Design a protein around this ligand. Structure first.
Ligand code: A1BXE
Lengths: 39, 156
């Protein structure tokens, strides 16, 4: 049995830790909802 | 039970201790999460029961108590914030510029941030704090790191 616990408000925070790159990826979505890498 | 707008942990007792299986967004009385998190099962909110209303394994989304409410989209230009809610750690906003999923059916925003699976369903926000999609369904790249689709539903 699953339950839910509140964890915060939905708000954009000025001065948030800015990170992660921006890759352009060729992908295929299957009927099971799993993405995969085409090349 | 608890219906306030906001971000929520999804927990189970069916494994060792209490384990965070994922995350979701309460908006307008509807709970939104990713299908793989709950697998369509009901949820508890105090005494409150939350029964599924809509879902699609392929979009990998599910809504509880109503229909999908979240209709904002990535503009394709500006940076966004993953409001990441990792297992046993505090809600932390991470700002990033999406990259792109190129598919035969069209192009999706993608966020290149590495977190445990139990962060699935964390919301992605625009500069106005609107939810433009959910994190935790995507691909494992050359490195071993995860890239997630910005997975948004359709509002009726
Ligand atoms: C490392 C990492 C980070 C975030 C999510 C996942 C993941 O595996 N997602 C997922 C997708 C589908 N389609 C089904 C089931 C799960 C659990 C993995």
């Amino acid at each position: 049995d699953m339950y839910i616990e509140r964890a915060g408000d939905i708000t954009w925070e000025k001065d948030a830790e800015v990170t992660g790159n921006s890759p352009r990826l060729d992908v295929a979505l299957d009927e099971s909802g799993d993405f995969s890498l085409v090349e | 039970g608890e219906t306030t707008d906001g971000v929520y942990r999804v927990m189970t007792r069916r494994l060792l201790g209490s384990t965070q299986v994922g995350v979701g967004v309460m908006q307008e009385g509807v709970f939104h999460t990713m299908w793989h998190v709950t697998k369509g099962a009901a949820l508890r909110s105090g005494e409150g029961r939350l029964d599924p209303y809509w879902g699609d394994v392929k979009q990998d989304l599910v809504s509880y108590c109503g229909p999908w409410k979240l209709d904002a989209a990535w503009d394709g230009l500006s940076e966004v914030q993953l409001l990441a809610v990792p297992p046993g750690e505090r809600a932390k906003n991470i700002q990033t510029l999406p990259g792109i999923f190129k598919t035969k059916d069209g192009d999706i925003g993608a966020v290149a941030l590495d977190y445990p699976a139990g962060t699935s369903g964390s919301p992605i926000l625009d500069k106005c704090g609107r939810v433009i999609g959910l994190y935790g369904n995507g691909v494992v790249i050359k490195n071993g790191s995860y890239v997630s689709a910005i997975t948004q539903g359709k509002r009726e």
